[PDB]
Design a binder for these strands. Structure first.
Lengths: 52, 79, 77, 40, 98
DNA sequence: CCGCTCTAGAACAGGATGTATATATCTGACACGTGCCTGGAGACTAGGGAGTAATCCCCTTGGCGGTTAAAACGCGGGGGACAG
DNA sequence: TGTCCCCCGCGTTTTAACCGCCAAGGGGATTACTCCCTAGTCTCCAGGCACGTGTCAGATATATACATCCTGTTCTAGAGCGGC
């Protein structure tokens, strides 16, 4: 989360950072696969056929 | 023990899909189904290994397999 | 090596536990006596019309072996 | 190398065999079953 | 003389009906037994499995794969197809979260 | 058969609008300080459940032939996935 | 709509699967002795929690500025036509 916070130029850990930290790690994503995180959203990924 | 992933033969994978109501089976399904079964077996048996290791036992029992399947939401009746 | 070497020296005896089961049956002994029968009959037909009446003869030089086999059978009872 | 039309009758079930002795002519499968019945 | 020459699909549906109402184990015993030992030997050596222990593993693996094949087949008609694909299985595992 | 003009695909530059940032300032929870105070820790008592040792009988592994069901190979072909 | 190549139905020949039978010896299961450490208190005290508050990073705001996407114009290649 601290590494994710440095990515968007933030010095405070916010629930968006925690969701990004959990989902980026494969071990954390599988462990928390059935876990819902409030005010975290999802990963900013777009499928390949959707880009022009 | 080597090349035991081929023990699940192509008609055996064909028969498994027939139970699921699959009309036609591609030739690349058998390789994928073997990999999926290998991944699924690598999780259940490893969980059963920890269950057997926790009991100070050297042989994996059927009850430990049931607990390994139960903890992942795939509980099995009859054993 | 104390248990490996002597087992390695046994070649026919390693498979003897199954060879004896597969070979000491009714059909194998019938085949092995009929083979001697046809061998003798063909050889005499080639050579001379009368046929010998002796084939697959066993010698009995020791008498205590019968009692030893009786002891083994009695232990099996 | 078949006395009848080249292909025991291959490609068929076991309940069709016949080993009688009559005249044998190959004729290239009777000119390939008469050009596949004159092109269907 | 004309061979029967069943068209593809009818015997497959016949195999579907004969194997949905039956309960015999499709995967053979020792090929599934030997696969378990090879997988388990990577985690811990000198490991044994009971006969009924593999019996629990075999039925659970078949039912999981049959249920996966049911979702795999359901993806085919959803994609206007009757033939399953390796990408159909990948979609099935992703939706299930596996 | 070669040159000329028509036509069109495509790389390139300019306009457009929704966001990326550079401060200005608010601001509102963040963390530090304080005052407790309530739950963990040192110490003690007692006992009970497993570590260990032994037994035992039992059950899974290895190890054979037999056989007939089935995997595998290949040929024919046929209906469907996919490019369009 | 077509196709063609990818998959199914079937003939043949191996092939390992299952049951038939036999021991083996690690190993699951049971019983018992005993020994450590966890159940259960007394007291307390130092870390944790409620309260209070200065404060420092985030959000609002807006001209400025990216920034890529859409579109218009021009460049150059390709096919068609006409003359020698």
């Amino acid at each position: 989360a601290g590494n994710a916070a440095r990515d968007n130029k933030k010095t405070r850990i916010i629930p968006r950072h925690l969701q990004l930290a959990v989902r980026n790690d494969e071990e954390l994503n599988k462990l928390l696969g059935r876990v819902t995180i409030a005010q975290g959203g999802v990963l900013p990924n777009i499928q390949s056929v959707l880009l022009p | 023990l080597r090349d035991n992933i081929q023990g699940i033969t192509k008609p055996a994978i064909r028969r498994l899909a027939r139970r699921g109501g699959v009309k036609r089976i591609s030739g690349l399904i058998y390789e994928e189904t073997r990999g999926v079964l290998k991944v699924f077996l690598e999780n259940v048996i490893r969980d059963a290994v920890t269950y057997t290791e926790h009991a100070k036992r050297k042989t994996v029992t059927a009850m430990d397999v049931v607990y390994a399947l139960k903890r992942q939401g795939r509980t099995l009746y009859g054993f | 090596e104390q248990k490996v070497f002597f087992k390695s020296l046994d070649h026919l005896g390693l498979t003897f536990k199954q060879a004896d089961k597969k070979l000491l049956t009714t059909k194998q002994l019938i085949s092995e006596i009929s083979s001697i029968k046809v061998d003798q009959t063909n050889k005499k037909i080639h050579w001379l019309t009368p046929k010998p009446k002796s084939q697959l003869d066993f010698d009995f030089p020791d008498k205590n072996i019968f009692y030893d086999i009786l002891c083994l059978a009695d232990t099996f009872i | 190398l078949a006395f009848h039309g080249p292909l025991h009758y291959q490609g068929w079930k076991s309940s069709w065999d016949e080993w009688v002795g009559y005249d044998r002519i190959r004729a290239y499968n009777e000119e390939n079953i008469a050009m596949k019945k004159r092109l269907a | 003389k004309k061979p029967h020459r069943y068209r593809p699909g009818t015997v497959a549906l016949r195999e579907i009906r004969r194997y949905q109402k039956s309960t015999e184990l499709l995967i053979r015993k020792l090929p599934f037994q030997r696969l378990v030992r090879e997988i388990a030997q990577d985690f811990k050596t000198d490991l044994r499995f009971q006969s009924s222990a593999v019996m629990a593993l075999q039925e659970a693996s078949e039912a999981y794969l049959v249920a996966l094949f049911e979702d795999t087949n359901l993806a085919a008609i959803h994609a206007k197809r009757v033939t399953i694909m390796p990408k159909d299985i990948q979609l099935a595992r992703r939706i299930r979260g596996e």
